[model samples]
Target: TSAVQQKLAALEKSSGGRLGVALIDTADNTQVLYRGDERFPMCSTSKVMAAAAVLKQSETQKQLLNQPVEIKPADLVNYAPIAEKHVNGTMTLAELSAAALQYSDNTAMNKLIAQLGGPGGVTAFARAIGDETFRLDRTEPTLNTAIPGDPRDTTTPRAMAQTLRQLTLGHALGETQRAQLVTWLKGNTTGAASIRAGLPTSWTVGDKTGSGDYGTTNDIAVIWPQGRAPLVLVTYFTQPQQNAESRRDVLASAARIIAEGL
Candidate 1:
């Protein structure tokens, strides 16, 4: 095996779990597949699909983004950093969507899912965007402890890679809305210590990071390498032995190895 192959193997070995990754070159249709089509819980990473569903609704329904939605106490889930302050108050649909994407706010994510008519809407949107074996079974915090085969808010690395690819090419959404989605993703600070940690400061990535108990740490990113076409990388680590932060180091290591090849 080559160095990158060995590193990926070591990541799985050390974590005592499954590690699935799929990296795609949007320019050439080249793919590097690992754990092909294996499904794992998405955790906060589901927010990306949720946001897309909301954006699509905004275009179809009209006035969806500007409409106001009140955040009731029941809507405030624990472990949310962004929407905690706005609990028991009102916020526009767009504001909630941004909060979920930027901060991985569980509260904001639930709000968006409800606004889009629950997990079914997000699931429909995922299908609309050409994803297979991707399901948004529950809202945030419900799947925080989800297992590898749980099938609740779960997806394969390939499914995630496809979703990001569509977003990059402005599929399933207009250019204006797609650009806004990218803007929110670019401002995401949740995964700074994960996949983004592996890239050079000069490069940019629009990504979503998800972490859960039992050593599940996942990151799906659209990497904009300098002087090259954008690439999509979906890395999912599940049922591992390490904590979420420790698992992030494996992703950072893999990202660095991928960067060297690029």
Candidate 2:
């Protein structure tokens, strides 16, 4: 009998600009608002793939944080800032993964991908989780430009939400790997806002934010509250001119709308 009508009304007023957002409470099989349907470029949010890849492999190989791993120059996929720092350098898998997720370090992500055997492993792992449209699309150079790797990753907002749900449910990795991945996501929001804006002060939100130019921007996240069902929120396929602040507001508005009601 609860629909968060007031909150939804407020979101209807505050949601400004062109943005695609999806919200789901998988525990209840509920859909709050589903925006664009097909695959949309996920921007840096695809780093989630790298996270899954490393942790999945780690679980399969029984390599924990103390276990050492190195980054090789040959593993660099793109020349993004994080990649540059790691190209000729070495860091633990945990360290590189932290850098990749927290710092959105491209180099660290590529190294992790290489450790797991490139895009193929990441792709397979992502599919296992539930991202039908999620993959390293070579044609979209807008995100991966300036570097040697392809810049585009295609995913629908709904699929991104689905992927995060699987990750939250430990479907992508074992209990150990899932805990490690959640730990990583907790501290690494970078500088973008979406889920955080809508949550209450007492809520603990673990998620990632991603941004890209060239007519597309996206943020995909899984929000877990102490007493509420985890919510999967995805904001992708934004109009090119939409600024980060606005997109953050758009997603927050959606969260505030749906979560407050729930």
Q: Whole-model Cα lDDT per candidate?
A: 0.82, 0.64
User: Which candidate comes out best when scored by lDDT?
Assistant: 1
If candidate 1 were superposed on the true structure by all CA atoms, what would the RMSD be?
1.8
Q: How many residue pairs clash in each candidate?
A: 0, 3
The reply for model 1, stretches above 4 Å from the true place, is 1-3, 240-246
Give the winner by TM-score. 1
Cα distance off (Å), candidate 2, residue 248: 2.8
Q: Which residue pairs in candidate 2 have backbone atoms (N, alpha carbon, C) closer than 3 angstroms, thus clashing?
A: 40-155, 83-107, 144-151
- lDDT assessment of candidate 1: 0.82
- The true-versus-predicted C-alpha distance at residue 66 of model 2, in Å, is 5.5
lDDT per residue for candidate 2 within 71-90, as digits (tens), equals 56665554355555655555
Please give the distance, in angstroms, between residue 222's alpha carbon in candidate 1 and its true position after superposition.
0.6
